[PDB]
Design a protein that fits this description.
Two copies of one chain form a homodimer. Chain A has about 300 residues and is of the alpha+beta class. Chain A is built from eight helices and 13 strands. The interface between A and B is medium-sized, with 35 and 35 residues. The complex binds ligand CY6 (2 copies). The site of one ligand CY6 has 25 residues of chain A, from strand 2 and strand 12.
Chain lengths: ~300, ~300
C-alpha cells in the first residue's frame, strides 16, 4: 500500500503551547526558553489592514502575554519581534525540547503539519509546499501557530508556522524565522495565491513508486527528450523538468530499471491519453505531493 | 481543506518497544508492566503453516525474550499467551503509559496507525476497517506489532495490532485482546480477503462535508426511498443503507439543511452519471474512509 504518511508527532506535540493577548488566543512553539507565535496575535478588531506591528508591540509589556503549557502557566520575561513572529522569552526552559533546527523549505518539498487549537494538538497530516508558496492544509479557527516539520533520525526540522487562509481556501505561513513563504504579508489586505503548477518531479517519483509497488500498465516503449517533454509539460500546467530533476531521480531509475526520460515518455502519454478509467497505486489523479525522498522512505523494499 | 487526518501520535510513540526471539524481531506495545506482541514472533523457519503456538511457547522461557525500550533493555519476568498475542510481564512499568483502554472496532470505523520498525516509530496515517475486515495499510518488513488507535480527549483507545499482509497487498491484524478482525489466522496458510464493499455511510458523511465545505454541485431536487436506494447500492457494490445509518447522519443533515434521503438521491445520481470530469473536495472518487464522526471533528465550523 502507498499512503500519504506523516512523521510521528510526539517530539512536536511537547512543544505546543497556548499564547494569549486581549481576547486573541492562538498556538505557539516552545523551544528551550522561547515561545514563537504569529505576531498577529497582538492585533485588535480595529487595525487589520493597517497594522503597524512596530507600534502595536511597543504598547505591550511582558505581562501583556499569557502563555499556557497546558495546565501550567509560563511567565514572559522579555519579548521581541522577528519578521512576522514574536519570540517570547520565558522563565522556564521546555523540558521536552527535542533536538531540532529551523529550515526554510523549497517548493515541492513535503512536511508534516500538527494542526493545533488552544495549544492542544488535534491532528497530523502530510502537506507539500506548492510551487505557488501556499499549502493545501486543513485549518479551522484557532489554528494559527500550528507548525510544519520533518524528522530525520532525531532532529525535528521545523519548516513552517501557520498564519492565514487565502480566498481559495489555501494556506500561507512563514518559516521559523518569521519570513513568509511566498509574496504574502500578515495583514487582512485582500491578497491571492498566484496560479499554481503541478509538481513534475513528484509525479515521476510517484510513478517509480507505482512500479516499485508492482504496477506498470502506464509504461510504454517510447522515450522523449527533455525539451520535447517540457513542451507538453507547459500545455498541461506542469513544472518544466530540469537536468537536476533527472539526476535526483537516478536512484529510483536504477532500482526499477526504467530510464528517467522513458518514465517521462510514459508520463507524457498519461497526460495526453488520460488514465482511461484506470488507477495508479489507488488514484485516478497523478499525485504530486510525494517527493523522491518520500518514495524511497516508503518503498525501501520489495 | 479536507485532509485524511491522523491523531497526534505522541502518547502511542512512548509505548513502542522492540521484542526479539531467535533472529525474529518485531514491535510490541508497552503499557504499565506488560508488553503485547504478535505471537508469531516465536515462529521458526520450519513450521509456518503448522505452528502450534502452544507447543512453541512452552519451549520458551522468560530470558527467551529480549525487550528493548530504545537504548534500554527490559527484563521479561513472566509470559502468557492471549489469543494471537503474547503478554510479556516486565520488571519495569512504562513511565509514559497514557490513560488508555482496549476497543474492538467495527467495520467502517477509522483509526490512526503508527507504522513502526525495530521498535522505532516511522510514520502515522489514518485507515478504516474495511467491511471485509482488512485494512489498506502501508507496511514494510518489520512492521508487525505496529498499533492502530483513536484518542478522545486523553484516552488512547487501542484498536488494532498488525500481524500480516494478504495476497492482494491488504493487511490483517487483531484487537489488543489478540482476536483477529475477520476470518484470518496467524499462520502462513494461503488465505484471502473476502470481497470488499464500499462503506455507504462514510461516503454520505463525506458529501455532507463537501457541502459544509461549500461545494454542492452534485445535489439535485430528487429524493429516494431507503429501499430504492439499496437496489442501486447493490448494483454498485455499496453497503445497504439502514435506518440506523440514516439516524447517525441526523446532526450533519440538520447542520446543512439537506435531508438524508435527499443526499442519498444525490449519491444515487453520482453513482449512475459518474462525476463527469468533476471533483468533490478534491477527489474524483467517492471517498469512503471518513466517518460521520470524522467529518464533524474536521468541519466543526463555517
Ligand atoms: C488563524 C488565527 C488564530 O489562530 O487566532 C484566532 C483565534 C488564522 C488562520 C485561518 C482560520 C480559518 N482557517 C485558517 O487557516 N489566521 C487569520 O485569521 C489571519 C489573521 C490576520 C491578522 C493580521 C490579524 C486572517 C485571515 O486569514 C483572513 N483573510 C485574509 O487576511 C486574506 C483575505 C485575502 C483576500 O487574502 N488574505 C480571514 C479570517 C480568513
Ligand atoms: C510483519 C512481520 C514482522 O514484523 O517480523 C519480522 C521482522 C509481517 C507483516 C508484513 C511484512 C510486509 N508487509 C506486511 O504487512 N507479518 C508476517 O510476515 C506474517 C508472519 C506469520 C507467521 C505465522 C510467522 C506472514 C505473512 O504476512 C506472509 N503471508 C501470509 O501468511 C499469507 C499468504 C496468504 C495467501 O495469506 N496470508 C508473507 C511474508 C507476506
Amino acid at each position: 500500500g502507498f499512503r500519504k504518511m506523516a512523521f510521528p508527532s510526539g517530539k512536536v506535540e511537547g512543544c505546543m503551547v497556548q499564547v494569549t493577548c486581549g481576547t486573541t488566543t492562538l498556538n505557539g512553539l516552545w523551544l528551550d526558553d522561547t515561545v514563537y507565535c504569529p505576531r498577529h496575535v497582538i492585533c485588535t478588531a480595529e487595525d487589520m489592514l493597517n497594522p503597524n506591528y512596530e507600534d502595536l508591540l511597543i504598547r505591550k509589556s511582558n505581562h501583556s502575554f499569557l502563555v499556557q503549557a497546558g495546565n501550567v502557566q509560563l511567565r514572559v520575561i522579555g519579548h521581541s519581534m522577528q519578521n512576522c513572529l514574536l519570540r517570547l522569552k520565558v522563565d522556564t526552559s521546555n523540558p521536552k525540547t527535542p533536538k531540532y533546527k529551523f529550515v526554510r523549505i523549497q517548493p515541492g518539498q513535503t512536511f508534516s503539519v500538527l494542526a493545533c487549537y488552544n495549544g492542544s494538538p488535534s491532528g497530523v497530516y502530510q502537506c507539500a509546499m506548492r510551487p505557488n508558496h501556499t499549502i493545501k492544509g486543513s485549518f479551522l479557527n484557532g489554528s494559527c501557530g500550528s507548525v510544519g516539520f520533518n524528522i530525520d533520525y532525531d532532529c525535528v526540522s521545523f519548516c513552517y508556522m501557520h498564519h492565514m487562509e487565502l480566498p481559495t481556501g489555501v494556506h500561507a505561513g512563514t518559516d521559523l524565522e518569521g519570513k513568509f513563504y511566498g509574496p504574502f504579508v500578515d495583514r487582512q489586505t485582500a491578497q491571492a495565491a498566484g496560479t499554481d503548477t503541478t509538481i513534475t518531479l513528484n509525479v515521476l517519483a510517484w510513478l517509480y513508486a507505482a512500479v516499485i509497488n508492482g504496477d506498470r500498465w502506464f509504461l510504454n516503449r517510447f522515450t522523449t527528450t527533455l525539451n520535447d517533454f517540457n513542451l507538453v509539460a507547459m500545455k498541461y500546467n506542469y513544472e518544466p523538468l530540469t537536468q537536476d530533476h533527472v539526476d535526483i531521480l537516478g536512484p529510483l531509475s536504477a532500482q526499477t530499471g526504467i530510464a528517467v526520460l522513458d518514465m517521462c515518455a510514459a508520463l507524457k502519454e498519461l497526460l495526453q491519453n488520460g488514465m482511461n478509467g484506470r488507477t495508479i497505486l489507488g488514484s485516478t489523479i497523478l499525485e504530486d505531493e510525494f517527493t523522491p525522498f518520500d518514495v524511497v522512505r516508503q518503498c525501501s523494499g520489495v
